[PDB]
Single-chain antibody, 231 residues
C-alpha cells in the first residue's frame, strides 16, 4: 500500500533547442488532507547529487529558469522542458511526500542554492554484520530551521527515502523498510546529522545522501557517502 510512482519514458534522446516532456503517475492521489499536493521534481547529473527543480507540482525552485514547467493534479503529473540545452542532460526523478513512506519515480534519462553546504563523511568499506555511522555537517543556513532527510541510491536502482529527523526537536519519521536498521540523530551544537546503519548486508551497499528539506520533501542534497559491504 506504499505509493508507486511510475515515470515514462525511461529514456528520452533529444537534440538541443527541442521540447521535452516527462510523465509521472502515482498509484494513489497525492492530494494531502491539508490541501497541498506534495509532488516534486529533481535532476541528477551523472557525477553528483540531485538538484531540486519543482516543488508542489508547479513551483520552480530559486534559480530554475521559467522554461521548466510542472503541471498536473491528483495522480497524473508532467514536467515540460521547453528550450533544452546542454546542462539539462541527466536523470529526472519525480517524488511524492504526501504519504509516508515518501517514494521516488524510477527516473527518466534525458540525452540554485550554492550557499547551502551539506558535507558528508567519507566512503565506508565493511564486512557483513558491521555498523557504520555516517555524518552530514550543515552550513550556510540555520540547521534547526529545516528537516534532514536521508536517501539510499543503489546503482541502476533509483532512489529510496529512508526517513527524516527534525533537528530542532529530535523528532523522527521512518520508512517501515528501514525503521530498526537505520537510526537518525542530530548534534545541534555542531549542526551535524548522523545516520547509523546496523547489521549490514550486501543489499545495504549503496550511496547514502543526507538532504535538507521541509516536512514533505528534500530541497538541497549532500554529496553522498558510499557504503560497500563485502566479505
Amino acid at each position: 500500500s506504499d505509493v508507486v510512482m511510475t515515470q515514462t519514458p525511461l529514456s528520452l534522446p533529444v537534440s538541443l533547442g527541442d521540447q521535452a516532456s516527462i510523465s509521472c503517475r502515482s498509484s494513489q492521489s497525492l492530494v494531502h488532507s491539508n490541501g497541498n499536493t506534495y509532488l516534486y521534481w529533481y535532476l541528477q547529473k551523472p557525477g553528483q547529487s540531485p538538484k531540486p527543480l519543482i516543488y508542489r507540482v508547479s513551483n520552480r525552485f530559486s534559480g530554475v529558469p521559467d522554461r521548466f514547467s510542472g503541471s498536473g493534479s491528483g495522480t497524473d503529473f508532467t514536467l515540460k522542458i521547453s528550450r533544452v540545452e546542454a546542462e539539462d542532460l541527466g536523470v529526472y526523478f519525480c517524488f511524492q511526500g504526501t504519504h509516508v513512506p515518501y517514494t521516488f519515480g524510477g527516473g527518466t534519462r534525458l540525452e540554485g542554492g550554492s550557499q547551502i553546504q551539506l558535507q558528508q563523511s567519507g566512503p565506508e568499506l565493511v564486512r557483513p554484520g558491521a555498523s557504520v555511522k555516517i555524518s552530514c555537517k550543515a552550513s550556510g543556513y540555520t540547521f534547526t530551521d529545516y528537516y534532514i532527510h536521508w536517501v539510499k541510491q543503489r546503482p541502476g536502482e533509483g532512489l529510496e527515502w529512508i526517513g527524516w529527523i527534525y533537528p530542532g526537536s529530535g523528532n523522527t519519521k521512518y520508512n517501515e523498510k528501514f525503521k530498526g536498521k537505520a537510526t537518525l540523530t542530530v548534534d545541534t551544537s555542531s549542526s551535524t546529522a548522523y545516520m547509523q546503519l546496523s547489521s549490514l548486508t550486501s543489499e545495504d551497499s549503496a550511496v547514502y545522501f543526507c538532504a535538507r528539506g521541509g516536512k514533505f520533501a528534500m530541497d538541497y542534497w549532500g554529496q553522498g557517502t558510499s557504503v560497500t559491504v563485502s566479505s
